[PDB]
């Protein structure tokens, strides 16, 4: 029922600025000065830092700025400061009393050197097809941030269940690594022409693929 | 200023449990604004009630919020495991302000004891190609989540490469994890067979799987 698209995530340094972004529709975000932005260090209670697009309340520093065009609204981060380290969410109303959610953006203060995720995909292996289970490994290792978003396809479909993804852990080389995996069922694996995951991390995309083999 | 929520609060399976959000005259006790928010660590929230008593949908019928004063209350009914999370209050005041409570825990008690799934995959095609043979051991399903691994290179221990993640809990509220072990194809196709061994509250688990004959 959201339109609220929020990138997933943003990174700098200290001293840098950040933008992020959340679009809606001309019902939603273009249809009045109604954002609003809100700041959640993980583990603790959200606290508003914008409303009605660019409204600092109280105790919001003006590094903080909020603005919008059509139907999207920016949240500008300037001078970035260790306390920044955050998820950022939107919301917007849109008709009917009815108020919209983004998905939130992890934002990462730089605390060590960017690394791409190293991208491994499993097909099933031949023990658990012989317990009727074909489920598909994406291993993901070697990153910072400790952001990833992951999706799969069967074929170029989206697929929209059996996915898991575990949270990303930092590991004994100081960098994260996560697992997705796509709890497929035997059929669907050997009836389609490939599965495919795709790592999202620091807004550029890897994708791997993997079909049926006979051995 | 916060709205005031206990830290925690506990039910078990099928029992209830009554959560409080204190504001003041200008916040909780000045209007209807008053909204409560699910939310599982490492998620994104859900918000569960809003205008005191009203869920959106898809909000099973089991919460339900009231407010007495300057004293919000959510029920959660029913209690299941899905419902162990962090619960926020929040409500709007004065001066376009909107006040957030510090959080209350809710904790299901008694979880049912799980013992781990394991699925020991060989190095990929694509991945050997690349000059690498890195084997994963993944690891579902389990409860609670405290999980230790051990590899074996043919029926020696494997001292060195294993990573394996913190367990994190998934969408059917059981931990899962990956142990990977980074091996050369030479290392690979030298032995016999490596082995993952998971071992959960004092069991353990064994697979093992060996260079592809095809
Ligand atoms: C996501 C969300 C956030 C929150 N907060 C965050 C602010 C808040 C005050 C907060 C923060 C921290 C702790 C406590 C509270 C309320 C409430 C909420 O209820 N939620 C879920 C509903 N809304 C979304 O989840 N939107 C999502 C993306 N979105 C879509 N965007 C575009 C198109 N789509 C098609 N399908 C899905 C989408 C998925």
């Known amino acids: 029922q959201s339109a609220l698209t929020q990138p997933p995530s943003a990174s700098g340094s200290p001293g840098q600025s950040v933008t992020i972004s959340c679009?809606?529709?001309?019902?939603?975000?273009?249809?009045?000065?109604?954002?609003?932005?809100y700041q959640q260090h993980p583990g603790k209670a959200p606290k508003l830092?914008?409303?009605?697009?660019?409204?600092?309340?109280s105790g919001v520093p003006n590094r903080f700025s909020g603005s919008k065009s059509g139907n999207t609204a920016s949240l500008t981060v300037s001078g970035l400061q260790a306390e920044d380290d955050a998820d950022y969410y939107c919301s917007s109303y849109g008709g009917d009393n009815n108020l919209f959610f983004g998905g939130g953006t992890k934002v990462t203060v730089l605390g060590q050197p960017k690394a791409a995720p190293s991208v491994t995909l499993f097909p099933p292996s031949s023990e658990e097809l012989q317990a009727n289970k074909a489920t598909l490994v994406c291993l993901i290792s070697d990153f910072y941030p400790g952001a990833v978003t992951v999706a799969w396809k069967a074929d170029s479909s989206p697929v929209k269940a059996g996915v898991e993804t575990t949270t990303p852990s930092k590991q004994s080389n100081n960098k994260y690594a996560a697992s997705s995996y796509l709890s497929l069922t035997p059929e669907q694996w050997k009836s389609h022409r490939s599965y495919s995951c795709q790592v999202t991390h620091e807004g550029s995309t890897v994708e791997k693929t993997v079909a049926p083999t006979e051995c | 200023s916060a709205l005031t929520q206990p830290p925690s609060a506990s039910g078990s399976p099928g029992q209830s449990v009554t959560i409080s959000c204190?504001?003041?005259?200008?916040?909780?006790?000045?209007?209807?604004?008053?909204?409560?928010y699910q939310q599982h660590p490492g998620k994104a929230p859900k918000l569960?009630?809003?205008?005191?008593?009203?869920?959106?949908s898809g909000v099973p019928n089991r919460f339900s919020g009231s407010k007495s004063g300057n004293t919000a209350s959510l029920t959660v009914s029913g209690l299941q495991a899905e419902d162990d999370a962090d619960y926020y209050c929040s409500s709007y005041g004065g001066d376009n302000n909107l006040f957030f409570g510090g959080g209350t825990k809710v904790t299901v008690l008694g979880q049912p004891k799980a013992a781990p799934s394991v699925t020991l995959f060989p190095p990929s095609s694509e991945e050997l190609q690349a000059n690498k043979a890195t084997l994963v051991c993944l690891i579902s399903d389990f409860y609670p989540g405290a999980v230790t691994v051990a590899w074996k290179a043919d029926s020696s221990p494997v001292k060195a490469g294993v990573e394996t993640t913190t367990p994190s809990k998934q969408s059917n509220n059981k931990y899962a994890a990956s142990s990977y072990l980074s091996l050369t194809p030479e290392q690979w196709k030298s032995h016999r067979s490596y082995s993952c061994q998971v071992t959960h509250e004092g069991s353990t688990v064994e697979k093992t799987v060996a260079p592809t004959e095809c």
């Open positions: 009605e697009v660019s």
């Open positions: 005259s200008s916040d909780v006790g000045g209007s209807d604004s």
């Open positions: 205008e005191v008593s």
């Open positions: 001309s019902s939603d975000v273009g249809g009045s000065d109604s």
